[PDB]
Design a protein around this ligand. Sequence first.
Ligand code: ATP
Ligand code: MG
Length: 280
Amino acid sequence: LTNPVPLNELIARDRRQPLRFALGIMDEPRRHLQDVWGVDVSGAGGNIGIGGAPQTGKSTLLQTMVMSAAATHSPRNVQFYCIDLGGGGLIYLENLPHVGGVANRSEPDKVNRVVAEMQAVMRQRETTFKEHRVGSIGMYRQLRDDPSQPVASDPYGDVFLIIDGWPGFVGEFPDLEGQVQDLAAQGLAFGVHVIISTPRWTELKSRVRDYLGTKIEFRLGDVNETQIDRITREIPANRPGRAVSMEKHHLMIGVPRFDGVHSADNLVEAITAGVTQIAS
Ligand SMILES: Nc1ncnc2c1ncn2[C@@H]1O[C@H](COP(=O)(O)OP(=O)(O)OP(=O)(O)O)[C@@H](O)[C@H]1O
Ligand SMILES: [Mg+2]
């Protein structure tokens, strides 16, 4: 599809599910139908890897993901921490109560504090789950919905670390790579998630990439480097927002706006209007 669907229409057309974030439109070609596509982050799809050549729509998808999550979940249950090294676009998400912080190049201390905070949660969750005899993240999410449970005082729910621009991240923060690897491989059992974009899959090493259970792939510089399959060869050139994912169906990512406008024009202004509208 060429014109992106705005989030207000995607949310409205979607059958909502806890920890389902609607993201765009999936062409399901056997029958002629085109439904709302999203990600289930409640289980093994909880970590997400995003690949694609320059200007293909990686940062916009992250904006759409966070806005979509924030429009359909409470800030008590979903929190995002953002490391923005992919164009600066994540800053316009920071006034959402779901977003605990957006860190960029101009404040390296915050990039370090953000990773350290994700580690603190996962590492507190490990002790908490044992001491409170919590059998699974699924059970932990239920217990937190009961205000009489000791665990319900945890202000955190499912916590997502977003890294837009992996090679620049490892390039400027080499010692944080190992900490993020540990979050990706151990976090999901404790409700700690990792979401990473990269221009090339080869720059996102196995030991991290293998723990991103949902891969989303825009048009690649080298189709031989796909993390999906040969379907990626079908993505049209110069169509930002066109992607493929694990179900091997073409996708058109929607836009992070709520004003009914089917384009990515004037998006900075529309994102803020969306955040305001989400305040409901
Ligand atoms: N889902 C979409 N629908 C329509 N147009 C889009 C979509 N996503 C992105 N675009 C257009 O493509 C442009 C580049 O998008 P974006 O900044 O998301 O690319 P990127 O993958 O983050 O690139 P880079 O690696 O250079 O940061 C956007 O400014 C927007 O105008
Ligand atoms: Mg970008």
